[PDB]
Amino acid sequence: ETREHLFKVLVIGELGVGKTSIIKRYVHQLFSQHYRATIGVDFALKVLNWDSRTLVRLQLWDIAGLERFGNMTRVYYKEAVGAFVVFDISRSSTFEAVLKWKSDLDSKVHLPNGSPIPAVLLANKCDQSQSPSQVDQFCKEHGFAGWFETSAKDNINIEEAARFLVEKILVNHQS
Ligand SMILES: Nc1nc2c(ncn2[C@@H]2O[C@H](COP(=O)(O)OP(=O)(O)OP(=O)(O)O)[C@@H](O)[C@H]2O)c(=O)[nH]1
Ligand SMILES: [Mg+2]
């Protein structure tokens, strides 16, 4: 009965937006307020008991904030099947930069069938433009599968956001 999957998932976004902390909360249920800046790429494995016929493992690639200015993202993205694209809900510079990351991603990697990999937008630090129709419009226009406000600090919506992205990866993996 049981089926096991291993998926490569990217976590990308500007310096200091929370990439590392969202992964540490989701995988280890821990949070530190102390900023330790990531160098290049860091990794985690999440093991998700999806349901009774399904075990999913995620290989989480934590891409550091500077890496879009370097020349290695094509290597980093290779064979990814999903992405979280993370900004800091308090700092608009980090929101403007999400399209730079999103365009980098869509230039460099696609699913085996040629489509864009699903990508979910995480507005992180929600604990610190609050808009229902606007979200939908933005995601449609820039090819995001959905959008969640998150807190790594208070553990808000990180689990739901992950399950949402995994759900899209599973449909694509069956298709
Ligand atoms: N209040 C609050 N602070 C957060 C949250 N997520 C991250 N932080 C803080 O924001 C700072 C940056 O978090 P990191 O997870 O290191 O950021 P990063 O995106 O991994 O940064 P780079 O490694 O430089 O790419 C840290 O001090 C965190 O404690 C959150 O949900 N709420
Ligand atoms: Mg980091």
From Swiss-Prot:
GO CC field: cytosol; early endosome; endomembrane system; endoplasmic reticulum; melanosome; melanosome membrane; membrane; mitochondria-associated endoplasmic reticulum membrane contact site
Modified residues (Phosphoserine): S52
Documented EC number(s): 3.6.5.2
Record motif Switch 1, residues: 29-43
Record annotation: effect of changing N71S: Impairs interaction with ANKRD27
GO BP field: antigen processing and presentation; endosome to melanosome transport; intracellular protein transport; melanosome assembly; melanosome organization; mitochondrion organization; phagosome maturation; protein localization to membrane
Record's subcellular location: Mitochondrion; Mitochondrion outer membrane; Cytoplasmic vesicle, Phagosome; Cytoplasmic vesicle, Phagosome membrane
Keywords: Acetylation, Cytoplasmic vesicle, Disease variant, GTP-binding, Hydrolase, Lipoprotein, Membrane, Mitochondrion, Mitochondrion outer membrane, Nucleotide-binding, Parkinson disease, Parkinsonism, Phosphoprotein, Prenylation
Outcome, altering M72S: Impairs interaction with ANKRD27
Bilayer topology annotation: Lipid-anchor
Coiled-coil residues: none
Reactions this protein catalyses: GTP + H2O = GDP + phosphate + H(+)
Top EC category: hydrolase
Regulation: Regulated by guanine the nucleotide exchange factor (GEF) BLOC-3 complex composed of HPS1 and HPS4 which promote the exchange of bound GDP for free GTP. Regulated by the GTPase activating protein (GAP) SGSM2/RUTBC1 which increases the GTP hydrolysis activity. Inhibited by GDP dissociation inhibitors (GDIs) which prevent Rab-GDP dissociation.
Family: Belongs to the small GTPase superfamily. Rab family.
Summary of the function given for this chain in its UniProt record: The small GTPases Rab are key regulators of intracellular membrane trafficking, from the formation of transport vesicles to their fusion with membranes. Rabs cycle between an inactive GDP-bound form and an active GTP-bound form that is able to recruit to membranes different set of downstream effectors directly responsible for vesicle formation, movement, tethering and fusion. Also acts as an A-kinase anchoring protein by binding to the type II regulatory subunit of protein kinase A and anchoring it to the mitochondrion. Also involved in synchronization of mitochondrial fission.
Protein name: Ras-related protein Rab-32
Organism expressing this protein natively: Homo sapiens
Parent-record interval covered: 20 to 198 of 225
